[PDB]
């Protein structure tokens, strides 16, 4: 047939509710009055009442805001019966896709990561590794891709730039020189991860390195 | 539309219950999982539970025997919502007609009728009149 | 639209039956399972069963040989409903033309024609006239 | 194929015009923009403009009231071309049947019928005969 396209809807929508999505008509109405109803999850099935149709006009509406994070899609079945009581049209499948929105802040894998390296090693040496995540999309948007960084190593002495972190992978390496277990054995540095490749929202962690 | 014919069912049916009547499908299922339910008298309304549907297949069943003498017809409404929670198809009316069976013995209007006539009258003379009824179909 | 061309078929065809003619697909199948059926004369209407379709694949077939002399053309209507039970596509008209084959011997108008002329007439003179016909194509 | 059912329409319809009948879609639209048009009597052919389609949505409409008594049926052909300019789908036949309504008063065959019989005849004797007609359906 000449079907009916899926209906994209934004998430965390907000204005005056209702909101008409689309209108359907059975043409077999030349004969009697036709009664429009509709069924499915989000319809009469759990979440009941997110969408409802006007039995007499054939309008479909979204009744309240949604979170794709909860349910990212819905499928519905539409009907049309006569006043006498007989169905007129083979039902009709209906689809709605819920488009992502940057509503989610990222989060570190652990609450604290630990590490260790020996004092005499050379600059350009891989030490630790850190993780974190965002729940929003990350396959068509940047709402879910992070960018790692560092902003405060304690013992801001001998110098304060002993390390760096790979923004994409979150791996840390020794960049400077002057490590001594004998004077300064354990650094505590603060890390952050951000939305949209360092553009969106950010959070903190803590990684602590002991020196062999 | 292309509706859906009424469903004739015999009365005082008897075999292994359930009994599948028919199966319905929403085609708008390309997108999510669809949940089939159904409503009305005989459904969720008094007589509750005579008919029920398998939320995931779309099969409709009669759960137990029936007596047209009690209820000779039912009308039901079918639904289909998405997992997310939104309805997909305008509901669908459903009808079932209960075909009669000779389960009823007749019964006299009164328990005793009385009459009277005079002794000298001629053959071919109307005296009394008697009544009785059967509740099964007669049309 | 992008319709669907008429289907030429030879007459007094003969090989292993069935014979696939063509295959149809509703694309609105992303959602549920679609059930292919078809209607008309030669279909469900008299001559019933000359053509039938595979509800699940969408193939159309000719089931047996034909004689254009009997019926030289067919028109059919195709359908596609969802498991839930709703139609998805406005039906679709289908046509088949039956190409002629030399299966018919001719036949004289009468079983015997009579004539008459006078003995003394000149050469190049029109006498009788005779008729006959063939039922196969001649156009 | 999965064709598309005839469309029943009442006669002497009346409300706010337009009136959407049905909507068609070419799926070959993944590539370019498709332009929906339609042709035939009642379309671009005399009666021009009873029905028209929205080149971009694919909706079909009845633009004004109708009288089956005038034309009781219509047949139409639908199209879909690309912006570049090429057709995508073999066109598609479309049918509409106009359902009768009691808009017609009957009328006597003649304006006056005459008759004659003899005075002495017996009761139960056939004299005249009278005619009249209605143009609405009677089948
Ligand atoms: C690292 O951890 C130790 C242990 O608590 C703490 O005293 C120190 O201030 C932190 N930072 C550095 C650079 O040592
Ligand atoms: Ca959200
Ligand atoms: Ca989101
Ligand atoms: Ca995010
Ligand atoms: Ca040292
Ligand atoms: Ca009984
Ligand atoms: Ca009975
Ligand atoms: Ca009885
Ligand atoms: Ca032949
Ligand atoms: Ca022939
Ligand atoms: Ca011949
Ligand atoms: Ca009229
Ligand atoms: Ca009329
Ligand atoms: Ca009339």
The DSSP annotation for A8-76 comes to EEESS--SSS-EEEEE---SGGGSS-EEEEEEEBBTTBSS-SSEEE-TTT-EEEE-S---TTT--EEEE
Distance CA A148, CA A139 (A): 19
A94 and B28 Cβ atoms separated by less than 8 Å: yes
What SS3 class is residue A195?
helix
Question: Between the CA atoms of C25, C28, C29 and C32, what dihedral angle is there, to the nearest 10 degrees?
Answer: -140
Chains with ≥3 Cβ pairs under 8 A against A? B, C, D
Tokens of D109: 């065959």
What SS3 class is residue B133?
strand
Could you say which of C27, C31, C82 has the minimum Cβ distance to residue A90?
Answer: C82
Strand stretches in C1-139, DSSP E = 7-10, 19-23, 34-40, 51-53, 59-62, 73-82, 92-99, 107-108, 132-133
Question: What is the least distance, in Å, from the CA of B67 to any CA of chain A?
Answer: 22
Distance CA A34, CA A82 (A): 5
Could you say which of A3, A27, A30 has the minimum Cβ distance to residue D22?
Answer: A27
Distance CA A39, CA A142 (A): 35
Contacts A77 to C, Cβ<8 Å: 84, 86
Beta partners for residue A54, in sequence order? none
Question: Given the DSSP bridges, would you call strands B107-108 and B132-133 parallel, antiparallel or unpaired?
Answer: antiparallel
Tokens of B24: 């319905």
Q: How far is CA B118 from the centre of its chain?
A: 53
| Cβ partners under 8 Å of residue D90, min gap 6 | C1, C2, C3, C4, C5
Question: Between the CA atoms of C59, C19, C93 and D2, what dihedral angle is there, to the nearest 10 degrees?
Answer: -10
C-alpha of residue C126 to centroid of ligand 11, in Å: 29
A38 CB burial (10 A radius; 0-12, 13-18, 19+): buried
What SS3 class is residue A117?
strand
C124 — alpha (psi -120 to 50), left (phi > 0) or beta? left
**Is A95's CB within 8 Å of C31's CB?**
yes
* Residue of chain D nearest C90, judged by CA positions: D4
Determine how many CB atoms are found less than 10 A away from the CB of residue A115: 18
Closest of C48, C52, C135, C126 to residue C100, by C-alpha: C135
C-alpha of residue A196 to centroid of ligand 4, in Å: 7
Distance CA D8, CA A30 (A): 7
Token pair 């923009």: residue: D33
Of the bound ligands, which one is closest to the alpha carbon of residue D66?
A: 12
Half-sphere exposure of B42 (CA within 13 A, CB side): 25
Question: What is the least distance, in Å, from the CA of D102 to any CA of chain A?
Answer: 14
Determine how many CB atoms are found less than 10 A away from the CB of residue C64: 13
Which helix H or strand E contains B10, and what residues bound it?
A: strand B7-10
Question: What is the least distance, in Å, from the CA of D27 to any CA of chain A?
Answer: 8
Residue A155 CA: nearest ligand 1 atom is 13
Distance CA C29, CA D67 (A): 39
What percent of chain A is helix, strand and coil (3-state, nearest 5)?
Answer: 5, 45, 55
> What are the DSSP calls for B52-101, one per residue?
EE-TTT-EEEE-S---TTT--EEEEEEEEEESSSBB-B--EEEEEEEE--
Q: Which method was it determined by?
A: cryo-EM
Contacts A56 to B, Cβ<8 Å: none
Question: What is the least distance, in Å, from the CA of C138 to any CA of chain D?
Answer: 30
B25 and C82 Cβ atoms separated by less than 8 Å: yes
Contacts A5 to C, Cβ<8 Å: none
Token pair 């109405």: residue: A29
Determine how many CB atoms are found less than 10 A away from the CB of residue B26: 38
Q: How far is CA B78 from CA A45, B90, C125, D124, in A?
A: 11, 9, 88, 63
Residue A184 CA: nearest ligand 1 atom is 14
Question: Given the DSSP bridges, would you call strands B73-82 and C92-99 parallel, antiparallel or unpaired?
Answer: unpaired
C-alpha of residue A13 to centroid of ligand 2, in Å: 10
Token pair 């390309």: residue: B30
Which residue stretches of C22-117 are H helix?
Answer: none
What SS3 class is residue B113?
coil
Of the bound ligands, which one is closest to the alpha carbon of residue A188?
A: 1
Could you say which of B4, B27, B58 has the minimum Cβ distance to residue C31?
Answer: B27
A106 CB burial (10 A radius; 0-12, 13-18, 19+): buried
Distance CA A109, CA D98 (A): 69
Question: Given the DSSP bridges, would you call strands A186-194 and A207-211 parallel, antiparallel or unpaired?
Answer: antiparallel
A33 and A82 Cβ atoms separated by less than 8 Å: yes
Beta partners for residue B87, in sequence order? B81
What SS3 class is residue A198?
helix
C-alpha of residue A82 to centroid of ligand 13, in Å: 23
Contacts C82 to D, Cβ<8 Å: none
Distance CA B13, CA B33 (A): 35
Could you say which of C4, C90, C94 has the minimum Cβ distance to residue D5?
Answer: C90
What SS3 class is residue D99?
strand
Chains with ≥3 Cβ pairs under 8 A against D? A, C
Residues with CB under 6 A from ligand 1: A 153-155, 186-188, 208
| Cβ partners under 8 Å of residue D29, min gap 6 | none
C-alpha of residue A126 to centroid of ligand 5, in Å: 20
Mutate to test the interface with A, among D4, D23, D51, D73 (most CBs of A within 10 A): D23
Distance CA C16, CA C61 (A): 12
C82 and C88 Cβ atoms separated by less than 8 Å: yes
């Amino acid at each position: 047939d000449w079907v009916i396209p899926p209906i994209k809807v934004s998430e965390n929508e907000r204005g005056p509710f209702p909101k008409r999505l689309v209108q359907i008509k059975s043409n077999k109405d030349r004969f009697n009055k036709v009664y429009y109803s509709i069924t499915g999850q989000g319809a009469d099935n759990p979440p009941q009442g997110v969408f409802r149709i006007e039995w007499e006009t054939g309008w479909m509406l979204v009744t309240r805001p949604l979170d794709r994070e909860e349910y990212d899609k819905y499928v519905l079945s539409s009907h049309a019966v006569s006043e006498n009581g007989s169905p007129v049209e083979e039902p009709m499948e209906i689809t709605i896709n819920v488009i992502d929105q940057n509503d989610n802040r990222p989060k570190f894998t652990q609450d604290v990561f630990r590490g260790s390296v020996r004092e005499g090693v050379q600059p350009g040496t891989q030490v630790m590794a850190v993780s974190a995540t965002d729940e929003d999309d990350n396959i068509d948007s940047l709402n879910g891709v992070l960018s790692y960084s560092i902003l405060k190593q304690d013992p801001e002495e001998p110098i304060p730039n002993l390390f760096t972190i790979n923004r994409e992978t979150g791996v840390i390496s020794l960049i400077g020189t002057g490590l001594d277990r004998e004077k300064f054995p354990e650094y505590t540095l603060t890390v952050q991860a951000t939305d949209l490749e360092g553009a969106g929202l950010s959070v903190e962690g803590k990684a602590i390195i002991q020196i062999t």
